[PDB]
Amino acid sequence: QEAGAVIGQQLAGDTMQDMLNNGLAAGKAAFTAGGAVHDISAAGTGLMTQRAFNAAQRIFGDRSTDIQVWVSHSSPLFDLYDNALANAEQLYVFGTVNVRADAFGRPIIITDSPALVSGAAETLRHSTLGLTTGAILIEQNQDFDSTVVDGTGKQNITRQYQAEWSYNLGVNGYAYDIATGGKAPNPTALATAANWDKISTSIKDTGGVVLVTK
Amino acid sequence: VFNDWAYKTMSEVLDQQVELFNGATRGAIILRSAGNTGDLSEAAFWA
Amino acid sequence: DSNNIKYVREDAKKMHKLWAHIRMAMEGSRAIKDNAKEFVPHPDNTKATTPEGVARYKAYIERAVWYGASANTVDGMLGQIFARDPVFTGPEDKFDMLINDVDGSGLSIHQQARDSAEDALSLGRGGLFVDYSARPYIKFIAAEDILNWRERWVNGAKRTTLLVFREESDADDDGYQIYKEEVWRELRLVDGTYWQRTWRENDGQLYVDDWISPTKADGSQFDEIPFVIFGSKNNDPTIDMPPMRDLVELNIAHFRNSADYEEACFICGQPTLFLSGLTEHWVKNVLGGAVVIGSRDAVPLPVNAKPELLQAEGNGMVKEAMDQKERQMVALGAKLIDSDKTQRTFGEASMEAAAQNSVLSRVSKNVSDAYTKALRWAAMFLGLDEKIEYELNSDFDINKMSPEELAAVISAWQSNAISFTEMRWQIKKGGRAYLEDEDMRNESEQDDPL
Amino acid sequence: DSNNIKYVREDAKKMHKLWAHIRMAMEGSRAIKDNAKEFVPHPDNTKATTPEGVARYKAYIERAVWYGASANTVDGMLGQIFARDPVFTGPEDKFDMLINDVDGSGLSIHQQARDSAEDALSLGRGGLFVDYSARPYIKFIAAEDILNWRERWVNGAKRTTLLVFREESDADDDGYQIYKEEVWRELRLVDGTYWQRTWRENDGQLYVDDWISPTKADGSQFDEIPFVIFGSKNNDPTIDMPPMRDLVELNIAHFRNSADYEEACFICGQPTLFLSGLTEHWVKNVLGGAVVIGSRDAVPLPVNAKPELLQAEGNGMVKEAMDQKERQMVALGAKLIDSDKTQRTFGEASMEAAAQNSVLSRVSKNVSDAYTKALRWAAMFLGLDEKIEYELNSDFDINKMSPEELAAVISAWQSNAISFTEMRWQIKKGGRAYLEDEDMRNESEQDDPL
Amino acid sequence: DSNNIKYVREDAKKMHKLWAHIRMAMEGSRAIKDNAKEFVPHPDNTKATTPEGVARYKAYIERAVWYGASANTVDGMLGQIFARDPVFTGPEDKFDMLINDVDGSGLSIHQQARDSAEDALSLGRGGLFVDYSARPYIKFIAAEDILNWRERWVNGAKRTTLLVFREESDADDDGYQIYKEEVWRELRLVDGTYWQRTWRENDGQLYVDDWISPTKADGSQFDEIPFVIFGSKNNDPTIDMPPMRDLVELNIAHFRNSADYEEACFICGQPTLFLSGLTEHWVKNVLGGAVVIGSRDAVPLPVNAKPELLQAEGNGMVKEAMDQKERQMVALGAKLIDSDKTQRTFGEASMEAAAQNSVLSRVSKNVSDAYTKALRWAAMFLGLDEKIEYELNSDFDINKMSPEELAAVISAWQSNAISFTEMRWQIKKGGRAYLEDEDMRNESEQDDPL
């Protein structure tokens, strides 16, 4: 009968998951609207261990140091593992085939968020987007409310659990176009480009870049 | 070497890793906790 | 560095239901009857859905009687535990600020100790907090206000690094209305130093103070958070089982059986005439839809008619089950309720007194240790002495102290076996002296001819 | 003054109903039978709709009996707390005015303390207001009069900032009819300074008067509001649970069962002849609509006629329910009645008195602390010594001292273990001496007549 | 069956089932009602297949009552053991850092000893760890945390060469996201030397640290592993038998019988009319599908009608089974009830005290020896004195000491039979003093206060 406790555990987990996924989707959409995207789908298989990241560095320009992480789906990580595990160019030894970084001091963080994957079969595309110092900001507002309410009129007394909360999204150098968007945006409303204005004059000030690999 | 559980710890909590906040991603994703009024919070700076 | 405030640890989430049920039990009959759906299941759900069934449920619950022995159990336990007053060891003239008004509200430390002991005996959790203002205040944090803590191992030592609790307050405008401020307090321990953040949360807003580290009279900041959590089992951040759980469960079972018994009493309690072997001809001829049952009047019956004054009989097995519940609660709680019928042999009960005072002894030590630690932290704030002690009345089953005991303690004081202050505390605890020690002394050096 | 000063907090409004229920239970039986509609469910709502049903309901309620165990319990508990007299420590000649006419009505402070203790025992709330007229007066504020309070955290200290209580007075016109004028006192604490203001209504306009800060005799005004709110649990402004709720509930259940039992006794308590196997021909021939029931005359019956006297047998389940509920009240440890048949092996109850007097001690400590604070505030107003105390009777079960106890306390006196005034307190406590210690010293300091 | 044939039978995998059962029995009625199935088999599996069958099973279980005698048992057992406080032998000004906070968390050594004794009483296994961090720390390791150990006889001595235990801690990241990071400590004894290392699993991969040798203050490494396992049986690595297995069985059987009894009470505890010899034509004529049973109205019946209020009669065989299991639970020797009816001659209880306090004394001795070892190992780490003892209370059924006992102990100390510290320990143990002996002496050098 520990329904409240079970719901609490699952709700904490899914709240973390939902804020993370919404932040990732908003970041990807905003960077795509800003032009900081490199599409690698036609060149060879679709993803290279390390030569692909140089494209994102070339996008971000003289401030390439300001990127120090690569949020990625698990499939790109396994593709890096496989290509590294088959070193056509001999720069790996058996003790170093499990490198997680990108040979530039940037660790690669792995998550399977649906915001970083799209399509199926031959249209499957993975987004592995790199960040800057505090590029994507998520501010939860401390307004959690929850109730348990019983119901009368049915064959059994219907018990309910309902919760509500809120948080705020902010991507560095980008503003959410509320006129084209809305007062309260859906998760698919955040992922839609043209709702994300580019405030900062230079792409370097804007924090992040998206790498698209199949 | 941990297999024996407590009660109902087998209840699935999550399958996607969400440990991607603040120091976990070298400060890439900031998860703060601050209130703000209205559906919008805008800050103006010189161009 | 500031994240996920107003988040409650999931162990507390599992424990809120038990805490709420225990608080309802402490409240009395009204709380239990307000939520009878949780405790008393409806005897028939098919009728329960219908409107004619819900009124039956209301009438069923109103007739029910709430024993509410749990509240008495807690009140009685708080009784012997706080007989007389706790003893304080250390200077008194420089510690009057904490004794007379512990939190600045004029409330003595003894009353806050009583509240904390009752809280830690009913549902087995509580917290103390001391913070500099110049004068420190020994706060009291309820079991439900503490909602987050952390325990990591820094240099191989059990340390409470993070601790967050909630405090309620009402902002004072020029009007007379009541508002609420859910001010949280964030306590952190970085690299063996104590830091705390407060969240202003202005009325209608949410604002947060800057980081600051309280420091002692000399300095050196701190190495442990000045927040102690006391429980029925011990003084650890981990959740402890409330001591009243089994007694509340027994009380609830007794309550539902009392509901059944009272319904049976209302229905079949009154004797019924039960005119048998009767005919409608006889009814409409002589009875006329009215029977006179007084002594002066008799009634006739036809041939082979048997009237049976039938009613529910006493010692119903439902009542037997309720008696089992009462006996079982008596077996668990020491003195939740008393019995005039029973007789107890003296001397045999002295053997089991220590076991019957097990919870009382623990709670006393757990509270005594918590308050001693809080007072030591306050002394560190004020730079007073550190060898002070606040030890509760660990002696229970108190009573007026016998003349033979009086001669014994006087003779022990004549010898060097009991100190003068120990004998004074004895004679006070036995209800024979009431003045403080110094007054008795300063009147004792007076050369009264009598 | 954003709104009217007469705003009442939500919790006080929610508690007025429970306070009214407690008061109605305390007063006696006449108002309980007056308001029995709410408590006693009418045995059938279909009948209750009709006027004959309500007439039957009035005849049902009137026949019932109200046990009134709650009133006796309060009276007994109050008597245990108020035996002999509360002991006042400090200068007795400087505070004679406070002891004699505490509030200007000639009422002794001990009797006002008795009123306060009874109020805190029945419904568990009260108040004490120390003001300045030259002489300070210790008010008494009823539970239903304190109607607003606020408690901010100022510099980490729980304080009371606003407290508005109504003051109800009788207008003294030239006529002999009864008017009623009510005045609202606004006690506010701004920037650590106590300010009081009074509000009076006159000709449809509510006036404000003006702000004023009462000052101590030397000066420096006041740092806190001179108003203590004692209660059943502690000296907290927060509403405390009334100690008499469970008793009242049982008393109501016992009253309903008594109604059922008394109706059954009235109807079916009489034996009835119940002549069965009877024919109308036989009745109109030999009975003629009348039966002789004395020993002198005997009546004949036809063949196969069965006369049997039928009456409700004793030890029914409603009677056993009433006996159970009476036992449950006694089990709750409430001091309502005694049982001569029941006996107890002496020495068993001595261990248990601490649990029995748990509530007695709690209320006594709360009231003693409240009155001590009030006396300290009055001393501050008068510029007198402030280290004064006022203690109630903490040693319950008052009894006459045995010769052994007398000899023991006397022998303790010449030993430097009991002060002379402590021995005098004991000797008056045991009913072996009645005149004051100074009078005894004056009379016994003369040469013994021999 | 031939035990000489090889078999491996030592690992916690053997005992998790009963350890978990003990844990949920200690938890109370919530866990037992929650995990009903393994304790209460379904009345019939054929019914259990149907959804109405599982609804019937929940109706059957939710009505049950968990007595919870085992929780009260271990409570009384621990209370008897931990009355007053254990006596520490040796220097105190040097060991104060261990007494005040044994594991560097503000938790005194006495409270950790109480937790260890509770673990030994409940499931009969616990562990103590001492590891130099600077300051040595005595840790408490639960029975489930001890994972692996091996015993190999070396030079004719049984040595516990390897021992592995899980180290549970809470991860505090930048946020408050609740995680749980596990650490494994391997304590190895190679060629008469003490070695240790830590295994860390961060995101699934098992990092391994390098071997280290904690060395004493003077050096010379060690010759034994600073880890002691204690239980009800003895201080051996082999699994000790939990002292409350049969009691938990009795409680579970009583629980299932209570379920059956309560289902019976709910169903057949209400009296029922059982109108016999009745025709539906007569029903629809007069009764009309409704009966008025109150004593104000009667009901006519046709010829050969026998109304029968039938209900289950008390003192049933299930009732007797529950009573017999309660008396069996109290018979085994557990201090699980305090029945008011039973009388006992004083003195025969003293005759049976030695047998009744068997497991209590065993646990007291085992925990005393374990903590003696832990303190000696900490002394080796700090290079302090070795002749240090720490024993719990060895005398049970403790009570206030009589005036005759007071005179006896004082007279004995006046002779050369009881040391001054021993007399002070005895008198404090009897509830007659609270100050330490040294402070008594410091008060007692000067002359009689007079």
TrEMBL record, chain A:
Domain of life of the native organism: Viruses
The name this protein goes by in its record: Major capsid protein
Organism from which the protein derives: Acinetobacter phage SH-Ab 15497
Organismal lineage: Viruses, Duplodnaviria, Heunggongvirae, Uroviricota, Caudoviricetes
Automatic annotation (TrEMBL), chain B:
The protein's name in its UniProt record: Major capsid protein
Residues of the full protein shown: 8 to 54 of 321
From TrEMBL, chains C, D, E:
Lineage top rank: taxon: Viruses
Name this polypeptide is given: Portal protein
The organism of origin for this protein: Acinetobacter phage SH-Ab 15497
